Design a binder for these strands. Sequence first.
DNA 1: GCCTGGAGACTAGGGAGTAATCCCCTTGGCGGTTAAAACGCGGGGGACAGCGCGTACGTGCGTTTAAGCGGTGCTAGAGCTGTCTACGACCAATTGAGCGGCCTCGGCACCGGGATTCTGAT
DNA 2: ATCAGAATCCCGGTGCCGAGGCCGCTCAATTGGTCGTAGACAGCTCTAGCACCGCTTAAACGCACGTACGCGCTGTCCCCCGCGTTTTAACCGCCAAGGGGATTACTCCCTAGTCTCCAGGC
Lengths: 107, 108, 95, 97, 97, 98, 180, 80, 82, 106, 109
Amino acid sequence: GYYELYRRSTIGNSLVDALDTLISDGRIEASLAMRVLETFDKVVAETLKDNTQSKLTVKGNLDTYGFCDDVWTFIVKNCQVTVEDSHSQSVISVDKLRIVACNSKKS
Amino acid sequence: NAEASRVYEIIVESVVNEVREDFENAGIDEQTLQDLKNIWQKKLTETKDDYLISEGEEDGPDENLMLCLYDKVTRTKARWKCSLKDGVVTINRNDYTFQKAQVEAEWV
Amino acid sequence: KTRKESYAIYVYKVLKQVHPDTGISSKAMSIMNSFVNDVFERIAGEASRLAHYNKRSTITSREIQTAVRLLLPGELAKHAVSEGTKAVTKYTSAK
Amino acid sequence: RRKTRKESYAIYVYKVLKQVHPDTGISSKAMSIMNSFVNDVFERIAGEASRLAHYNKRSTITSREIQTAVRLLLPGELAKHAVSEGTKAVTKYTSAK
Amino acid sequence: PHRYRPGTVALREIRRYQKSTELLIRKLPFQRLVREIAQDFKTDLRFQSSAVMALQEASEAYLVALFEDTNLCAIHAKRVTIMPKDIQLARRIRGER
Amino acid sequence: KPHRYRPGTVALREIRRYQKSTELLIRKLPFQRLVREIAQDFKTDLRFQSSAVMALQEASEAYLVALFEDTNLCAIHAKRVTIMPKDIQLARRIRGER
Amino acid sequence: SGIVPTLQNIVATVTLGCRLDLKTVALHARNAEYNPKRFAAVIMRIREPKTTALIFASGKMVVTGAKSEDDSKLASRKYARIIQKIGFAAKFTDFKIQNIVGSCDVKFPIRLEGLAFSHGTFSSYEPELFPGLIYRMVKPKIVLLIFVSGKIVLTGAKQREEIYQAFEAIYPVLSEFRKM
Amino acid sequence: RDNIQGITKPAIRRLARRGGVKRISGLIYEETRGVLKVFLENVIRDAVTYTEHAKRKTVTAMDVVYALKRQGRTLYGFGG
Amino acid sequence: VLRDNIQGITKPAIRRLARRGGVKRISGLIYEETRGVLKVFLENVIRDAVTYTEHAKRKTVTAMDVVYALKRQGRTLYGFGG
Amino acid sequence: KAKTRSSRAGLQFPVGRVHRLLRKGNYAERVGAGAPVYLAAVLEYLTAEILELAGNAARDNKKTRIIPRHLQLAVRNDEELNKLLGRVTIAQGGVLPNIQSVLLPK
Amino acid sequence: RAKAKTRSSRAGLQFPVGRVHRLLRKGNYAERVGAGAPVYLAAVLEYLTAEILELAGNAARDNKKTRIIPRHLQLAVRNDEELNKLLGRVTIAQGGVLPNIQSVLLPKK
DNA sequence: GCCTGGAGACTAGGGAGTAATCCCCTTGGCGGTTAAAACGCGGGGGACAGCGCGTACGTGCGTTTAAGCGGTGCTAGAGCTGTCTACGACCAATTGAGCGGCCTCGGCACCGGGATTCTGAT
DNA sequence: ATCAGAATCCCGGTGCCGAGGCCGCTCAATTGGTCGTAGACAGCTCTAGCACCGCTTAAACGCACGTACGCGCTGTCCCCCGCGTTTTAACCGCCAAGGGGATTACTCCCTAGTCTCCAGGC
């Protein structure tokens, strides 16, 4: 009953390759590796929920969208993203952005 | 930038702390914890028809992906406003983390 | 069952006797139906509570009269009691 | 003569008291207040279950109606723990004879 | 140009909306609000039209009566503008909070 | 000079004392006589059980105490300390008693 | 007159026969929205031509948002082609267009109160409920939306011809209640 | 009669002290006597109605509790 | 700008509700306070109505469910069934 | 021949239906004969009173059709019926046109 | 015939399931009453009694007493938010009020 | 002419009406006496009126946008109906749990005296 | 800060009455069996609730600007609070008498239950 959404993230990607390298070595059992990944997902969710303060806006064309299994998948084109560091707005022009979403609480 | 690095350090510390108890519960020595954390830190530092979308794969470092939660979605004919939450984004080999975002999209 | 239950016919008869050339909206009909049901439920509940307080098992004219006195304000209670006793007297006389 | 019996929840309140506080007593006026409280909550839940059975065109008051009336009247934490206790008691009673 | 004296248009709206019977909240945002609130309790709930209309009638009645009490207790403080402390006072006296 | 207490010190002491205690604050014979005079208007030659007058007194004192709490709250709302009858009238109006 | 209405939205229906497993359709296809609990259908849209396909369980699909009727059938052809690409084999049958909506502007102020008074039994006007008056006609069965500005909405027509006579019929009545 | 004056100025002052009131105007006493008289007339009216329904001439404690219950002022401590 | 559903109870709507209540002058925080109060009231009434619905084993909230929810709390409502 | 109980009592409300609702509504194991007659008379009187005041309100607004606004005016303008229905909301009824004196222009 | 066992003992309750069942049957609430309804209701009554009696015993300990008086029940009820919500319209005889003085009335320096 | 509650007749059982009794409890009176109410006074501090200032709120105007309308789709789900079976009413015999009465002793209350705290003037 | 007086808190002693336990009894709860019917469940129908479109237009919103008003400050005077003295009536106890509430027993009328006709609505 807990979201597997943040596995694809770069931080998550780094963890999955590191566990895979460890499993290849054989230092630990695979079920434990799954357990660690689940813990990572839970910890990352709460820290994102509270420990971040940055504000940003996406202005762009919408190439494709999808909504299946309570997952919203937006492909956004020529985005004008303005991000401010916590410690000024910075304009970045990005050709393509993939938005993967999920409802706060799933039923 | 700075904020993303600091938050990433909180994730690293918190996860490494929490994980050890299950490792010890099943007979895994504390050396593995250090090994996983150091190699993991090193990789983060170094790394920083048309209709059918079934044939979709992670392009690589170049692609830009948003993993986030959606508060609610609004429906308009041209505009496609959508409120998003708890998202980590990677654009131009840089990591930007946010709690909430607003995306406005255009239906061509 | 498909058939339902409403007080509309009686309310219409009362409306004609009181004001012959006035209609009533359907929404106002739903309001009057819910008003009659709510006042009936209040009076019947108070009368049932009354019969339970006195260890009785029957709802009589006395329990309905006392529940009318208790729930209805003084002028309304006095005139509703007069109406009820007049109706009970007429009903018993004709048997 | 002999006064006719006047049933009260005095002994049951006293048993529950000796369970939660084995050394604490209770005055007669506090026992009358607890009796009034049990009667009041009883008639609230029973009236709500009666109206509940009447709304759904049913003629039996079961654990379903009492459970829904507990969810209705009682506050959320109180309702959750009262539903848990009632469910546990009905389960244990159905398990036995 | 000509500008209406302050408080004349406010009284005009008071007379207008106290003479009217229409609903003062737009029906679609109120329906979206109702569905959002209802989601937290039970998921995949459907709502009858008349149910949302009854909810809106009750909400507008409750808020109009609250505003009446708020205005009365703001006049009691020898003021005209109503502040949230007036709402908190009215609710506290009513027993809502 | 004799010893004197500044105004409101003893009022607060009475507030703490009567909020700490539970006895009835109205004398029982005046309240009983008031109850019987009022009941003379409904039915003549009425008799009252002692526990009935006691229940009436507990209910009346609790009603008056809650009313004075609401009266004090709406007096403080007007940036005041002294309660006037308009405070009572506001409290009874908001509660739906007028 | 000298005005001809322009068709904007065509509402068409197509049945496909075999029952569909919507989950595969939602996953494979793009521009799709399938919330099963709220609605038992997937909402699908294509950029060019702009249309909205609602694909249901039994196989019936509803296409809307089409400027023309040939454009509507062409859009249905595109939807059928892509659904064939999804992996479900179905044959198009019983194509029919039940409703088309037409927008025209007379470009001259009209008085709604006179029209309401003249046709009070025939038609109903309610200012607070709507700033326009609905106009129901027994023959042709075309609901008409009339406005103070003079924008006339034509709806309820199986075919274009039916709205065209209905607009022609309404034009004298609109001229009668002209302002100044 | 004079019995409403039996609700004395110190008794009303004590009731206000339990309510948390620090200063009392001179007209609170007459206002409170009027409020208490209205409340007592309501409750005793309902209680005498309950009594008369039971064909009794004595106002029992159950009449007072029952009357308070339908005015929403449920009283614990006197039976029922 | 996209807003929360609770913000869908717009400022003019609250101002009209105040005008019907007789409120000549409104502060700026009355709107947020009223949105919070309305959210609390709606939460209570919709929770009671959804409980009434779940008892009947229905998945649709009926107007009679809302009427029974409102009636228990004493805020009776005429015009949607008795 | 059969005569309805309402005509015997001299009422328009159905004594039989009120008797059925009393017997089936779980109020007591037994219902007296005079109770539905009395209750129907009281309900009919209250209906006649409310409808009379609503018809007066409708004539005041120059209408020949009772709408919820006229029911609200009938309830909230009479004091006794406002005491009776003080916790009752009437849908599409609005409020009484009352403005506080302090807010009126100087 | 086997030895009689009370319904409360079967349910593991102290409150009388049989008396609650008879009161539900005689109370004119429905023509029929289920078997688990008095069990459920007796469990709910016992739980609410246990909550108030535990809080009242705590209040009596706080006043260095070993008997529960109406004051302790009043303190227990009005000090818990949920129970005060449940008994908001309820008056507890000889209970007093909660010690509560508004901060504006306190003296100043 | 075809019906779904309603009226008519009849029976049987029990609930309510009525009459006598008893004893509880309410009502009425006397007296002491003491604490509480009433009354006078003076002072201070709070209610209240006036002023003043800046500020936030009303008003208007142009812009935007979403609420409302109308129509159509379909299918989930409300509603209704038939059938059967588990489950609750009922009844009778039994008997232990719960209540009335009685006793007794400890928690609490009353008194009094020292210790602590708090308030106000210095 | 300080100090003295007044009020409250705490500690101990004595008493007293009410709560807690025991016993006896009786009646309501329990157990076992029967039976009738409500409710569960499956199956069929068909309504309306949740999507989509687009048009229109009035309503929301953002902002500019000015001004009524809220809130802070100041002065005044009046009336509420603290306290001391006097008066009074509430409270406790004690007694007495009789009304009336509760109980029991007998009766009889009144309402549920059932069956059969029926009458307005269609």
